[PDB]
């Protein structure tokens with residue numbers, strides 16, 4: 037089988053779930069296996085922020101300090117003195133995977149326990165937000181804190197972005213940010229044909245954890261929701277984006 041082949045080739049564990057919304061056909065490979073969700077959670081966190089606020093509320097400007105800065109603050113490190121609006125923070129978080137921006141949004145919604153509670157409310161009993169950055173990226177095998185599964189991430193992403201946990205105007209924002217992500221070119225985007233729109237959010241963590249979750253639109257007809265998660269068995273392992281791209285191609289063939 038092709039996913040086993042990719043695990044073999046990249047010496048890694050793959051977690052895959054894809055749902056063709058058109059036909060309810062699915063592709064599944066260790067779909068219920070836990071991985072550290074890493075930055076992929078920022079997409080769901082914006083979903084909860086959008087539930088909580090009106091669009092016009094997203095213009096509240098948040099002031100933060102160097103204390104709030106962590107690592108990978110490409111957008112937030114520029115605006116310490118001016119602050120950024122909640123909308124701008126969501127943009128940075130989703131499109132640049134700006135860690136401080138996610139931390140600030142998380143705080144506005146009540147922190148990790150409040151995020152968990154709202155995820156439970158939308159039907160996700162799997163995803164387990166517990167920690168802020170940086171600590172959430174540090175997940176040891178067998179630990180369930182700050183993990184989810186491919187199936188649950190797909191189910192929660194679909195629910196915010198495509199179903200009825202948000203109204204259309206807010207769904208449109210989420211999709212637009214994710215469509216215009218800067219960080220995923222070598223992942224799920226590299227395994228879909230040009231001309232098929234992709235909205236995605238990437239993550240990376242310890243044990244070589246390398247994640248992408250995505251909504252993929254064919255030219256015509258309903259979208260595919262997909263999570264490709266991976267991890268390796270050594271703590272300081274490196275990842276290869278190419279695994280995610282290759283796994284994506286196998287999914288697309290399995291569905292077409």
Ligand SMILES: *C(=O)[C@@H](NC(=O)Cc1cccs1)[C@@H]1NC(C(=O)O)=C(C)CS1
Nearest residue numbers: 074075076108133173219238239240241
């Ligand atoms: C979320 O996944 C974030 N990852 C971390 O902060 C842990 C690491 C820092 C350096 C290497 S792993 C941010 N998002 C992304 C991404 O989505 O691609 C990366 C690559 C690291 S910062």
